[model samples]
Target: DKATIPSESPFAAAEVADGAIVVDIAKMKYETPELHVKVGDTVTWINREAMPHNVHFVAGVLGEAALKGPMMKKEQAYSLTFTEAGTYDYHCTPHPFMRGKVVVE
Candidate 1:
């Protein structure tokens, strides 16, 4: 979530066209066509920026929640398995502007 690139540029735009979940880094926001999911469903995030990025849980809805990536070099990835019904709000530890939300049904 640096000034070098816009969040909606490539990352979110790419997912948008594909009708997938997207997180706009610069805006610290995320958009999902549907937030509801059942247990055993997994949500993954792949870091696609040159700058440092991490997916961190802010709401502890996930008991095992933690920061996942710096993803500064290699293609780092994180997965969250929804096993309970609740709302999860997470943000990037390095870049708070990058945020995401997941709802478990």
Candidate 2:
């Protein structure tokens, strides 16, 4: 029901396609930490590590906007569509230091 990364993505080198705004969860980090997405765009985060990972949005102006994602295992992915035009900062709960950003304008 969505787009897939070209030829099976490699966690080591995350690739960003023209219309595919993919975030890679590799080495307990989010590839392309600062991804500027257009309003209404859907962002997909792919888990590449054998370990599990998740996406937890840091609550913003929109009260309780803290969207928490499930623990996605390797080869698993999750997608979220942004409708609000603002900066959303997110990180992995298990790996707090692993942060990423999405700015919708």
Candidate 3:
């Protein structure tokens, strides 16, 4: 099942911590196009753009299970914790131009 957020309510950006980081999705692109993290770090993707977006990781790219998040409306978000060490390349399914990467070490 997909997760959703309040469509009419304004949302604030999430705080970043040592083992976690928030990646904002707006303007049809991933605001932090790339990031570095350690194994077990949690990466959160928050949708701030007017349009919907989804995060899909390439299979086997990071030696972790592939993932395809649900389409998220504004204020919606999803998170995944990395357990492997490798580069993960992902993209937005609805907007092909939107691309992002995570380097897990």
Candidate 4:
């Protein structure tokens, strides 16, 4: 029941108030290819072209499970929450040459 849920539960959205870093996906590249963020920060990728794009993390680059997103259509978006401090290298599945990084502190 709603009353049974603890107010401070980790699942509560209130516990994650860090702002999101927006990455623009256009012109076959990530506008801000390198980003610095803190743990608990959210990264959002917005696709601005008809080309299909996705976020595919390099294996073990973040000391966590690989993270990837499905192909996004024009104007679509994908969001991922960073829970650990590390450098994450990722790329587009269809366009491996298109790469980017997120450095968490």
How does each model score on lDDT? Answer: 0.47, 0.70, 0.70, 0.70
Candidate 1: segments with Cα more than 4 A from true spot: 1-34, 64-74
Give the winner by TM-score: 3 or 4: 4
- Per-residue alpha-carbon lDDT of model 3 for 1-105, expressed as tens digits? 111222323233453344547888888889999899887777777888778888876566643455666787777766777777778788987677789998888
- Model 3 spans > 4 angstroms off: 1-20, 62-66
> Model 4, 6-66: lDDT tens per residue?
1211222223235646787899999999999888777777787889888887556654455
What is the Cα root-mean-square deviation between model 3 and the actual structure? 6.1
Task: Tell me the tens digit of each residue's lDDT in model 1 across 1-102.
Answer: 100111322233223333333332322333442366665565655554455565666434455345344333223344445666777776667666656677
**Per-candidate alpha-carbon RMSD to the true structure:** 9.3, 6.5, 6.1, 8.6
* lDDT, model 4, position 53: 86
Q: Give one digit per residue, the lDDT tens place, for model 2 in 5-82.
A: 233322322333447668877887898899997776878888888988887765652345565677777877777777
TM-score, each model?
A: 0.56, 0.76, 0.76, 0.76
Q: How much is 24 displaced in model 3, in angstroms?
A: 0.4
Candidate 1 or 2, higher TM-score?
2
| Residue 28 displacement in candidate 4 (angstroms) | 0.3
Q: Count backbone overlaps in model 2.
A: 0
